[PDB]
Amino acid sequence: GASHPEIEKAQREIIEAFNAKPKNGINKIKEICEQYKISPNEEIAEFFHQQRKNLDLEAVGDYLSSPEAENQQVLKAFTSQMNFNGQSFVEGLRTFLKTFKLPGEAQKIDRLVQSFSGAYFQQNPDVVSNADAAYLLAFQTIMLNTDLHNPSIPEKNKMTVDGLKRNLRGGNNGGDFDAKFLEELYSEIKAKPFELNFVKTSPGYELTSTTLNKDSTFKKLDSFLHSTDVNINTVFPGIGDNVKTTVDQPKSWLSFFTGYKGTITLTDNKTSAQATIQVYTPNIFSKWLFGEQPRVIIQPGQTKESIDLAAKAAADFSSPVKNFKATYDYEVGDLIKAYDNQKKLITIERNLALKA
């Protein structure tokens, strides 16, 4: 319920370091915890709660929703430090979602929802059969919120309480959720929408516009998502010939909620450089919260040379980059310089040496 005395003492230095570069703030907390033998993960989580009014919450949300082991442990502690005892399922989920400047990336949103579902179950074992059941209820409720409150969805076509019960049959660990529980859940979310505050920009390079769908590279990228045995260099000629790829297909609910079409992970088999490419295309449901434009988010991995791989992919589009944002490992200036350098290279390949 409070930060360790040694952390509180250095709160200003930690805050200043974190906002300038999250990694430095996290490292400072870890250094203090090491010196005074303090459990670091719980301390980082407590600091986020304690200093929420002084920290870059977009960065806090990004750290908490990241896939790395440390981050996931901190998120578990962060959510465990919240008190859901006393609240209904919908109210607990509403409180949880309103706590963050929510990431605008599908997998990150998913991890946050999974954290809530696990904590809800831990604190309310009598409601659902298991954590998976809580997760199903959580994402179904999030979809229902859009379904019921998105003006573009005709009243006559919105899900009914009977429809909710029919669709969730067997969703409670093989069994069903109590009918009256679902009727209550439906009414609660219909009567009071969730408060959802998403970040305006995401880490890395984001391409998004009303004409991106006509971009030749975007088209090849979109098709690549459902391709088999195709080298990624057919989409991005710039990259090397030793780049391997894996594609994470989108969960249906994430496609509905955000327009997510999947993430492609590029890995250079020789340099180990890595980069991820997320694709989003708008649909009637996602437009309510994420706009009417397709999006491509490119992020370099932590391994060396990853920045150049990500920059090359971004530079290969004719379409411009709408936003540049620092990642946990790279400052925004480095992303911009790498991208500009790749664009300069392309310019010289097309026009030969600069005239003098």
36-42 LR contacts (CB < 8 Å, sep 24+): 36/4, 36/6, 38/4, 38/6, 38/7, 41/70, 41/73, 41/74, 41/76, 41/77, 42/77, 42/81
Alpha helices, DSSP H only, in the chain? 5-9, 11-20, 22-35, 40-50, 57-64, 69-80, 89-98, 106-123, 131-149, 161-167, 179-191, 216-224, 252-258, 287-290, 306-315, 332-351
Q: Which amino acid is at 142?
A: I
How was it solved? X-ray
Alpha helices, DSSP H only, in 200-324? 216-224, 252-258, 287-290, 306-315
- Quote the CA–CA distance of 286 and 301 in Å, as a whole number: 27
The one catalytic residue among 43, 46, 58, 105: 105
**DSSP summary character for residue 212:** G
Buried b (16+ CB within 10 A) or exposed e, 196-234: bebbeebbbbbbbeeebeebebbebbbebbeeeeeebee
Q: CATH number for 85-199: choose from 3.40.50.800, 2.70.50.60, 1.10.1000.11, 1.10.1740.10.
A: 1.10.1000.11
- Quote the CA–CA distance of 230 and 128 in Å, as a whole number: 44
- Quote the CA–CA distance of 326 and 58 in Å, as a whole number: 12
Side-chain-side CA neighbours of 275 within 13 Å: the count stands at: 28
Phi, psi of 299 (to 5 degrees): -130, 130
CA distances from 266 to 198, 239, 278, 280, 307 (A): 27, 10, 11, 18, 12
- Quote the CA–CA distance of 340 and 263 in Å, as a whole number: 24
The dihedral over CA atoms of 256, 186, 195, 52, expressed in degrees to the nearest 10, equals -100
Domain at 200-356: CATH architecture: 2-Layer Sandwich (3.30)
- Quote the CA–CA distance of 215 and 207 in Å, as a whole number: 11
Residue extents of the structural domains in the chain: 1-84, 85-199, 200-356
271 Cβ contact list (under 8 Å, min separation 6): 303, 304, 305
Give the distance from CA 332 to its chain's centroid: 18
Helix (H/G/I), strand (E/B), else coil: 93: helix
105 flagged as catalytic: yes
- Quote the CA–CA distance of 42 and 81 in Å, as a whole number: 9
Resolution in A: 1.4
Domain at 1-84, CATH class? mainly alpha
CA distances from 184 to 66, 165, 179 (A): 33, 11, 9
Task: Tokens for 132, please give them.
Answer: 């998976």
Task: Tokens for 7, please give them.
Answer: 């952390």
Q: Which residues are paired to 295 by β-bridges?
A: 208, 280
Handedness of CA 111, 117, 121, 124 (dihedral sign): positive
Which position has the token pair 């809530």? 116
